[PDB]
Design a protein around this motif. Sequence first.
Motif, PDB file in Angstrom:
ATOM      1  N   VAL A  12       0.827  -1.198   0.000  1.00 36.70           N
ATOM      2  CA  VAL A  12       0.000   0.000   0.000  1.00 36.70           C
ATOM      3  C   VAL A  12       0.866   1.254   0.000  1.00 36.70           C
ATOM      4  O   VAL A  12       0.431   2.319  -0.443  1.00 36.70           O
ATOM      5  CB  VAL A  12      -0.963   0.028   1.211  1.00 36.70           C
ATOM      6  CG1 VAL A  12      -1.868  -1.192   1.166  1.00 36.70           C
ATOM      7  CG2 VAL A  12      -0.185   0.064   2.512  1.00 36.70           C
ATOM      8  N   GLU A  13       2.090   1.124   0.504  1.00 34.50           N
ATOM      9  CA  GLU A  13       3.030   2.247   0.520  1.00 34.50           C
ATOM     10  C   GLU A  13       3.479   2.484  -0.916  1.00 34.50           C
ATOM     11  O   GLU A  13       3.565   3.628  -1.374  1.00 34.50           O
ATOM     12  CB  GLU A  13       4.268   1.925   1.352  1.00 34.50           C
ATOM     13  CG  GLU A  13       4.085   2.129   2.839  1.00 34.50           C
ATOM     14  CD  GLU A  13       4.200   3.588   3.230  1.00 34.50           C
ATOM     15  OE1 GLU A  13       4.306   4.443   2.321  1.00 34.50           O
ATOM     16  OE2 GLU A  13       4.181   3.880   4.447  1.00 34.50           O
ATOM     17  N   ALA A  14       3.778   1.393  -1.623  1.00 37.26           N
ATOM     18  CA  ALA A  14       4.219   1.493  -3.004  1.00 37.26           C
ATOM     19  C   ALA A  14       3.093   2.101  -3.843  1.00 37.26           C
ATOM     20  O   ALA A  14       3.336   2.982  -4.655  1.00 37.26           O
ATOM     21  CB  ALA A  14       4.602   0.115  -3.531  1.00 37.26           C
ATOM     22  N   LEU A  15       1.865   1.633  -3.624  1.00 35.71           N
ATOM     23  CA  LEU A  15       0.699   2.131  -4.353  1.00 35.71           C
ATOM     24  C   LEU A  15       0.496   3.625  -4.143  1.00 35.71           C
ATOM     25  O   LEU A  15       0.176   4.358  -5.083  1.00 35.71           O
ATOM     26  CB  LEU A  15      -0.570   1.396  -3.903  1.00 35.71           C
ATOM     27  CG  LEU A  15      -0.817   0.022  -4.517  1.00 35.71           C
ATOM     28  CD1 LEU A  15      -2.000  -0.664  -3.830  1.00 35.71           C
ATOM     29  CD2 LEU A  15      -1.074   0.195  -6.009  1.00 35.71           C
ATOM     30  N   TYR A  16       0.660   4.065  -2.898  1.00 33.45           N
ATOM     31  CA  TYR A  16       0.503   5.464  -2.563  1.00 33.45           C
ATOM     32  C   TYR A  16       1.551   6.282  -3.318  1.00 33.45           C
ATOM     33  O   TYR A  16       1.258   7.354  -3.839  1.00 33.45           O
ATOM     34  CB  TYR A  16       0.673   5.679  -1.059  1.00 33.45           C
ATOM     35  CG  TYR A  16       0.717   7.145  -0.695  1.00 33.45           C
ATOM     36  CD1 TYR A  16      -0.454   7.893  -0.607  1.00 33.45           C
ATOM     37  CD2 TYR A  16       1.932   7.799  -0.511  1.00 33.45           C
ATOM     38  CE1 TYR A  16      -0.426   9.246  -0.343  1.00 33.45           C
ATOM     39  CE2 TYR A  16       1.980   9.171  -0.247  1.00 33.45           C
ATOM     40  CZ  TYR A  16       0.791   9.884  -0.163  1.00 33.45           C
ATOM     41  OH  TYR A  16       0.807  11.229   0.116  1.00 33.45           O
ATOM     42  N   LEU A  17       2.773   5.774  -3.373  1.00 34.20           N
ATOM     43  CA  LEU A  17       3.836   6.480  -4.076  1.00 34.20           C
ATOM     44  C   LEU A  17       3.629   6.531  -5.590  1.00 34.20           C
ATOM     45  O   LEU A  17       3.885   7.558  -6.218  1.00 34.20           O
ATOM     46  CB  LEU A  17       5.189   5.843  -3.767  1.00 34.20           C
ATOM     47  CG  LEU A  17       5.731   6.183  -2.376  1.00 34.20           C
ATOM     48  CD1 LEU A  17       6.996   5.377  -2.087  1.00 34.20           C
ATOM     49  CD2 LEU A  17       6.016   7.682  -2.307  1.00 34.20           C
ATOM     50  N   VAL A  18       3.163   5.435  -6.176  1.00 34.83           N
ATOM     51  CA  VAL A  18       2.953   5.401  -7.618  1.00 34.83           C
ATOM     52  C   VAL A  18       1.718   6.167  -8.091  1.00 34.83           C
ATOM     53  O   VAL A  18       1.762   6.840  -9.117  1.00 34.83           O
ATOM     54  CB  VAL A  18       2.855   3.947  -8.141  1.00 34.83           C
ATOM     55  CG1 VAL A  18       2.398   3.948  -9.604  1.00 34.83           C
ATOM     56  CG2 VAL A  18       4.208   3.257  -8.014  1.00 34.83           C
ATOM     57  N   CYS A  19       0.625   6.073  -7.342  1.00 36.81           N
ATOM     58  CA  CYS A  19      -0.614   6.733  -7.723  1.00 36.81           C
ATOM     59  C   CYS A  19      -0.775   8.153  -7.201  1.00 36.81           C
ATOM     60  O   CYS A  19      -1.388   8.993  -7.852  1.00 36.81           O
ATOM     61  CB  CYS A  19      -1.795   5.894  -7.262  1.00 36.81           C
ATOM     62  SG  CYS A  19      -1.790   4.207  -7.938  1.00 36.81           S
ATOM     63  N   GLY A  20      -0.229   8.420  -6.023  1.00 41.86           N
ATOM     64  CA  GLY A  20      -0.350   9.747  -5.452  1.00 41.86           C
ATOM     65  C   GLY A  20      -1.771  10.294  -5.450  1.00 41.86           C
ATOM     66  O   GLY A  20      -2.735   9.592  -5.116  1.00 41.86           O
TER      67      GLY A  20
END
Lengths: 30, 30, 30, 30, 30, 30, 21, 21, 21, 21, 21, 21
Positions: A12-20
Amino acid sequence: FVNQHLCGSHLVEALYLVCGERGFFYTPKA
Amino acid sequence: FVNQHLCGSHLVEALYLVCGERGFFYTPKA
Amino acid sequence: FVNQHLCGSHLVEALYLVCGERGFFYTPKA
Amino acid sequence: FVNQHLCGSHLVEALYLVCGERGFFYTPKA
Amino acid sequence: FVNQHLCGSHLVEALYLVCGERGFFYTPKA
Amino acid sequence: FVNQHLCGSHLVEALYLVCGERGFFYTPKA
Amino acid sequence: GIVEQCCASVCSLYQLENYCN
Amino acid sequence: GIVEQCCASVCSLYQLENYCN
Amino acid sequence: GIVEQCCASVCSLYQLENYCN
Amino acid sequence: GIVEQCCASVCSLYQLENYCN
Amino acid sequence: GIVEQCCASVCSLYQLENYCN
Amino acid sequence: GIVEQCCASVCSLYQLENYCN
Ligand SMILES: [Zn+2]
Ligand SMILES: [Zn+2]
């Protein structure tokens, strides 16, 4: 960018970073 | 439980914790 | 809320979110 | 080691790192 | 301070805390 | 991918994600 | 939105449950 | 408290050791 | 303890409240 | 530096790649 | 390396200082 | 799903973009 092994909240951290600001959907299987 | 200021990745970490297997949607624009 | 598998610093994160300003005690076995 | 500004969950993450197995107490009110 | 089992992003977090403003180099094997 | 404000440990977490096995250098002074 | 309620202001874990699928 | 010393101001890892059990 | 149970097995947020001050 | 570009201002994942070894 | 040792085995904060600038 | 693949196997940031809004 390289391939990543992402589990738990780390994904979910990666997702937050990629999608913003676009936002995202977290849909796991269960 | 108590109230708290949750911003950025911290907010999605909390959603992951609360929702778990159910999954969630993070939509800033809404 | 759902059941969670929490290990390491991931647990102290959960504790911080649940207890907030009340504070908490982290007491592992050793 | 250097000095640093540690707030919110970041502060408890550092305590977890420093204290480890010994455990710790996070008490904002004190 | 105690010994720690640090993997993945958990290590870079420890490095950031120990080095702070001095900065650091993350050099894994591959 | 989108633009984002990345500070403190969040910045090194992103570097870890982007760089992975390649590794990275975090140099605030530069 | 979630951001205005949990970041600008404060919110509870119960409120966060409104965003679970 | 810990918050006033480590968040308001800055503090060292050694200072954090005062909060270990 | 909770530390062990949450990691070895599983635990709920309600169980974690027992550790708050 | 990286801090001035990604924290003061905003930066992309591509920009972060400049700091990989 | 430290990356490996800290994860495969165990490492101390003092050992991690060797990687600071 | 991506959730499973990223953890069971491996996944790329490009694959994760498919989940953005
Ligand atoms: Zn982890
Ligand atoms: Zn933060």
